[PDB]
Amino acid sequence: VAKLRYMSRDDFRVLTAVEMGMKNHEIVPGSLIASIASCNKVLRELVKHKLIAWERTKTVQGYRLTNAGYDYLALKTLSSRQVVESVGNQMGVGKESDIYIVANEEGQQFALKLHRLGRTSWLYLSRLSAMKEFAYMKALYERKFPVPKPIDYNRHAVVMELINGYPLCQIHHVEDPASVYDEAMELIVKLANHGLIHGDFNEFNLILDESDHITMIDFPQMVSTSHPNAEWYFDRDVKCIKDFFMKRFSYESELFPTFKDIRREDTLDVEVSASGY
Amino acid sequence: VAKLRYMSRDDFRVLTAVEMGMKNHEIVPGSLIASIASCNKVLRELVKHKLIAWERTKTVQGYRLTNAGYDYLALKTLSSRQVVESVGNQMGVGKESDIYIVANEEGQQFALKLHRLGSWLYLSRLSAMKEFAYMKALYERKFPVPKPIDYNRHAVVMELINGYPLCQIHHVEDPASVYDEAMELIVKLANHGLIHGDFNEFNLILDESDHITMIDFPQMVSTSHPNAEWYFDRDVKCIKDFFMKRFSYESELFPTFKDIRREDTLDVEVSASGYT
Ligand SMILES: *CCC(=O)Nc1ccc(-c2ncnc3ccccc23)cc1
Ligand SMILES: *CCC(=O)Nc1ccc(-c2ncnc3ccccc23)cc1
């Protein structure tokens, strides 16, 4: 679909200046912006295009970065590294993110995830979720877990292998409820067995391919199986999934896993809530 | 404009095989097709009938299904349930979707929607699913929608409304009342958590009494969506524009996304954007 959105180094480097400023200032002034920068027209155009936004408080007077701002910054960066040249449609919305089809010059198609923390908040937080995920995805990919191949990331943006499948949110019928139900329960366990309970395990965490085999997608800060309340969490993850199947597919099974089943094989909680080796 | 081509079960099994193989392989060699089924001539004929398409690239060498191929598979499957016996004339080119008149044995008429998105076979399979369930839900919540009848693959069968699409209507007795019927509907959707997303003159059918039925269940995004408003305001604009054009009607009784009294969690039940 869409090729890189032309804009001058002057727009760009200023935008970046606004990036750098927010670092040490909530609401950043043109003076600094301009200092860093090497202008005021650029600013008008940026505020025009809605790449930035300006606020006077009780005490402060200057400019912020809008998500559109950040979005670009990210894509420009990624464009540099060859990863993405072209951006298709928003496929959908995730827990607190946006997912688009993207591709590189060479024609290969990937998924771009764009973190948006602010269901109710900073761009910062979204940068750090992107991090945690990229790392989490690699751990789980190398260990032969069923997740996309994490490819690159920058800022709040995460490129990973595209999957031939629809998200479970939009699956309204399946011929083998037990099969998928089990592939899911079998995944929860494989996780715990490396020390990991997800915490917010819902339909949004699963893709189904054309052959109806599963893949995991949303990886926030997880909980360690040595967490005080590890169980409760485990309990929830399972409980949720059970409900969705019972509600969507009307599939129920008294075969739901329990904490006992967990037989630690790994220390994958090498960064997770209550690691305390 | 009645029954189409008769075919050998072999022809079908092969067609089925191509399908089966496209799950794991985009282009599928005879090897599998054969193995999947139990021959090569069959293929040649399907190619000839433009039912399938063979292709050779890089190192890849095998067959794929044509839209038409898919069409037949479906109809056959539909035949085998008495749900579709005969096929009337294509009614509209009015989306990435081809819509037809059809009838069963007893001769009752329904409308067949065939999804034409553009892998493509798959996403189209799943459009249909979404559409069915969505449409089912709305029907059951007493909305003005075609009663869904069945679906298979990229194909959805549903009640055939007795009236003409708004895009082919050049005058109405009381435009206002229609406009307000339309505006209501938009609202009532939002109130159960929904936004049609393609609400336009193509997706609204005026009946004998000038009462409105909705037909495209696509994005049908949730009101909890990031752009829930923009969608909303878009849908409204279509209507306004349409009447200040076809009918030269202009009212100031717009609905606003501000006016929205969530009464149901339909967005949730059917998952079309949305939250816990
Ligand atoms: C439950 C709905 C949801 O979260 N939406 C959604 C939309 C698209 C995808 C998706 N589809 C194909 N390939 C993907 C690769 C990587 C990440 C997400 C992908 C998932 C979920
Ligand atoms: C504006 C008209 C247009 O885009 N096309 C069009 C063609 C047919 C129909 C239609 N008419 C009667 N019953 C139907 C049932 C189901 C689907 C479509 C139907 C509407 C719009």
From Swiss-Prot, chain B:
<keyword id="KW-0690">Ribosome biogenesis</keyword>
<dbReference type="GO" id="GO:0030490">
    <property type="term" value="P:maturation of SSU-rRNA"/>
</dbReference>
<dbReference type="GO" id="GO:0005829">
    <property type="term" value="C:cytosol"/>
</dbReference>
<comment type="subunit">
    <text>Associated with late 40S pre-ribosomal particles. Interacts with PLK1 (via its N-terminus).</text>
</comment>
<comment type="similarity">
    <text>Belongs to the protein kinase superfamily. RIO-type Ser/Thr kinase family.</text>
</comment>
<dbReference type="GO" id="GO:0042274">
    <property type="term" value="P:ribosomal small subunit biogenesis"/>
</dbReference>
<dbReference type="GO" id="GO:0030071">
    <property type="term" value="P:regulation of mitotic metaphase/anaphase transition"/>
</dbReference>
<dbReference type="GO" id="GO:0005654">
    <property type="term" value="C:nucleoplasm"/>
</dbReference>
<keyword id="KW-0479">Metal-binding</keyword>
<keyword id="KW-0963">Cytoplasm</keyword>
<protein>
    <recommendedName>
        <fullName>Serine/threonine-protein kinase RIO2</fullName>
        <ecNumber>2.7.11.1</ecNumber>
    </recommendedName>
</protein>
<dbReference type="GO" id="GO:0030688">
    <property type="term" value="C:preribosome, small subunit precursor"/>
</dbReference>
<dbReference type="GO" id="GO:0004674">
    <property type="term" value="F:protein serine/threonine kinase activity"/>
</dbReference>
<dbReference type="GO" id="GO:0005634">
    <property type="term" value="C:nucleus"/>
</dbReference>
<keyword id="KW-0067">ATP-binding</keyword>
<dbReference type="GO" id="GO:2000234">
    <property type="term" value="P:positive regulation of rRNA processing"/>
</dbReference>
<feature type="active site" description="Proton acceptor">
    <location>
        <position position="198"/>
    </location>
</feature>
<dbReference type="GO" id="GO:2000208">
    <property type="term" value="P:positive regulation of ribosomal small subunit export from nucleus"/>
</dbReference>
<dbReference type="GO" id="GO:0046777">
    <property type="term" value="P:protein autophosphorylation"/>
</dbReference>
<feature type="binding site">
    <location>
        <position position="113"/>
    </location>
    <ligand>
        <name>ATP</name>
    </ligand>
</feature>
<dbReference type="GO" id="GO:0046872">
    <property type="term" value="F:metal ion binding"/>
</dbReference>
<keyword id="KW-0808">Transferase</keyword>
<keyword id="KW-0131">Cell cycle</keyword>
<keyword id="KW-0460">Magnesium</keyword>
<feature type="domain" description="Protein kinase">
    <location>
        <begin position="87"/>
        <end position="242"/>
    </location>
</feature>
<keyword id="KW-0547">Nucleotide-binding</keyword>
<keyword id="KW-0418">Kinase</keyword>
<dbReference type="GO" id="GO:0106310">
    <property type="term" value="F:protein serine kinase activity"/>
</dbReference>
<dbReference type="GO" id="GO:0005524">
    <property type="term" value="F:ATP binding"/>
</dbReference>
<keyword id="KW-0723">Serine/threonine-protein kinase</keyword>
<dbReference type="GO" id="GO:0005737">
    <property type="term" value="C:cytoplasm"/>
</dbReference>
<dbReference type="GO" id="GO:0004672">
    <property type="term" value="F:protein kinase activity"/>
</dbReference>
<keyword id="KW-0597">Phosphoprotein</keyword>
<comment type="function">
    <text>Serine/threonine-protein kinase involved in the final steps of cytoplasmic maturation of the 40S ribosomal subunit. Involved in export of the 40S pre-ribosome particles (pre-40S) from the nucleus to the cytoplasm. Its kinase activity is required for the release of NOB1, PNO1 and LTV1 from the late pre-40S and the processing of 18S-E pre-rRNA to the mature 18S rRNA. Regulates the timing of the metaphase-anaphase transition during mitotic progression, and its phosphorylation, most likely by PLK1, regulates this function.</text>
</comment>
